[PDB]
Please model this.
Amino acid sequence: NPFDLLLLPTWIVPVEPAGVVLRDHALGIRDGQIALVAPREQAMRHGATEIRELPGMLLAPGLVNAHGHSAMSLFRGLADDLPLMTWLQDHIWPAEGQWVSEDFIRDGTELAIAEQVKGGITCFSDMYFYPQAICGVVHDSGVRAQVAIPVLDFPIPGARDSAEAIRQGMALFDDLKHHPRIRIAFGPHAPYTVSDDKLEQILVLTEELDASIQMHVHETAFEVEQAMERNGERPLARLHRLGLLGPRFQAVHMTQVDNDDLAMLVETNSSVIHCPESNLKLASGFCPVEKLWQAGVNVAIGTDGAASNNDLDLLGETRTAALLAKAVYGQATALDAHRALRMATLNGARALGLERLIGSLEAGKAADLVAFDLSGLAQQPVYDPVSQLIYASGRDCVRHVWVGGRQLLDDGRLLRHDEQRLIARAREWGAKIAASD
Amino acid sequence: NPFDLLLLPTWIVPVEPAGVVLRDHALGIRDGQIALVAPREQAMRHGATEIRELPGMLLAPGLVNAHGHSAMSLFRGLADDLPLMTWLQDHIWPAEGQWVSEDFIRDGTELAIAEQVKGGITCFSDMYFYPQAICGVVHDSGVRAQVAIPVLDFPIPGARDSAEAIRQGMALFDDLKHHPRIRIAFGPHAPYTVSDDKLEQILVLTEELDASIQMHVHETAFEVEQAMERNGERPLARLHRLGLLGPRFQAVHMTQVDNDDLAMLVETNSSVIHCPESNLKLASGFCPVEKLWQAGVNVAIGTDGAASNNDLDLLGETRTAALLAKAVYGQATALDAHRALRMATLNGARALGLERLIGSLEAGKAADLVAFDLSGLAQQPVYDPVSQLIYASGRDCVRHVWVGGRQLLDDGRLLRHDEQRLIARAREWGAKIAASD
Ligand SMILES: [Mg+2]
Ligand SMILES: [Mg+2]
Ligand SMILES: [Zn+2]
Ligand SMILES: [Zn+2]
Model:
């Protein structure tokens, strides 16, 4: 009974146990799962149909991009450096009104997946329009995904109202019930865009389905202050009041965190999705990551959409996060390199409810893997491969990617996408969108 | 009268004038200098000995890395995530004492220059030991540099006291008087480490030689407080009192700025060198870049050493600066992409006193040029190439680099360095340094 594939990289970082880096080790894959992580000597005895040596490379769990709006890849750099509401009202919202259709979503989503896989990301979360179309693209691509159904108080592309959005959502939930790679979640945009009734409605359906909820929460001081002078109650407190908080709740951003907020996070075991670069670019503020971490809150990381980043580089986000957390907390020891990688992998898994399947290199879990090349000039000398990954390596060093043991990236080449076709298609869109803007 | 070389990129960003992007244009070089920036049809009638078509590429002034400690490349990732004093006392200082020799400086500096050229950097400033060694390496590499003589109250490698370091500096200044690419400066480390006397000596010398001074200034709240309590005056204030502040003074870091600090920067026309990533990583603080900018202070940008970054990626550093400035200032309009590119180029030139030579694509200036490929998937679609450069491109997109019209990088290949042996050398040093650590 040989492995299907045995990988022999210079270094393996399993993430669990924390801090550990393995040398002269092997990872064996069988039937899509990690069957063994062990010394090379030991593993070579089981036999393997295929054996790949990966000298100079670091093998890790695939990255988990825990929050995105993928098809906004087509809006990448459309209008930068404007006031937030000018950006939205003069540029993003009209462009969405004119251009967002199933064709837009299909092209923009595939564009985004292609970029993410190239950057070593094996699992992502999407919160955008035409979810059914999104799922189709995710299915073909082979990556893992949470697709969150957008629910709002007003018409959006694809849904004339919240009722239709939930109906389409429910139909989606059923159709993908046994999909091995995709899970449906609910994704109400933010507390300030969704009614209490809609929130309670979402909760019932969610507990009915054991499904997750992802929402932008406390992204700005303005949202929080305004909820005060209006309702006399912090948005998170309101969500807590209505019973939406919990281990399946994903609070995105959370730049505004007081002690009541914190206690509510620790109590409900809710996840926070950290999006540092978007927070900086939009002047939203500084998520207190080390503080949340020390309290025991699960903190994952996402890129947000490519129009406020403007790349979908999770390795890059993670470095930004690891650097920023030190200055925000006031200590150089905050969010260290191993914890940063954990945030980008196992914590993402936990946020998305997938921590039994992915996020660490342990026997029994899915073979969602990324191999990073550390043999480049600018990475020398390599004293600690994980330090060098986090603080000195770019996403271009990603060489190979597997999801469920199926290879999606081979020496930097995408096996499930035609890169030049997507480029050409993205250009056709950009030409049209540029003209309308 | 044909050009030696004519370049035909999709885009040209001359930096001067600001905000302008030229399409269907050409840059013509003759005798190491920019001779013509005009429409292609006008420029082609001049004829050219060599013509390069660069479709999909953005042609810009070469990036100027205005602060670093280049040979610390050999300590890259040696000991991360430690308290600052533990990092210095238990890792960096021991290793400097034991290993920093002229050979170490040569290897470490060349390694750093190779990484920098690959990332589009045409000019850099160094503040590290064995300045004579550094200059030799800089000469061979063909890049432009300011080499600042380290001056300190303590024995440092190569110089047992400030008087010897100044004697070596003076000799170096005379040797290299006619070098077209290297400028010598004085680099007292920081005010807390250089006597009131040594500083006045340096001042009389630079005024006599019209040389620049670079120093780490107000890097930490700690430094400032300690001075305030111990002397009754802020380090900047003391510098201004001694008459050191001026157009040739480069104040590095400046995370601590009060209203008096600002006025003194404004009145003296001193440059600030912003190093956001080092400031984040060491939890030094947040330089108020937009505040300085709006007050008319010239702000350049540097990477610092590779042991507190941990790369020498100025494009990446600039992205970090541009993102960070918006949340630090509280507005998404702060440090826009064109101004950020200006900081990485012309402001760098001004900082180093080289603004008449480099920093912008204007006739009469040196042909110091970088070509960035924007034809990649993750960069599509391109609306503003400058926005896409700053917010969505990695340094791996750097394809071609010229210094004084001499090509140093051709389609990503170094013409003046052998990467493979530089890597082997780096690994030799890594083995030794790892053992002693
Ligand atoms: Mg990014
Ligand atoms: Mg860097
Ligand atoms: Zn979002
Ligand atoms: Zn420095």
Notes: Chain A has two domains: 1-61+365-437, 62-352. Chain A touches chain B through 71 residues (CB under 8 Å). Residues B 277, 309, 311, 313, 316-317 surround magnesium ion (ligand 2) (CB under 6 Å).
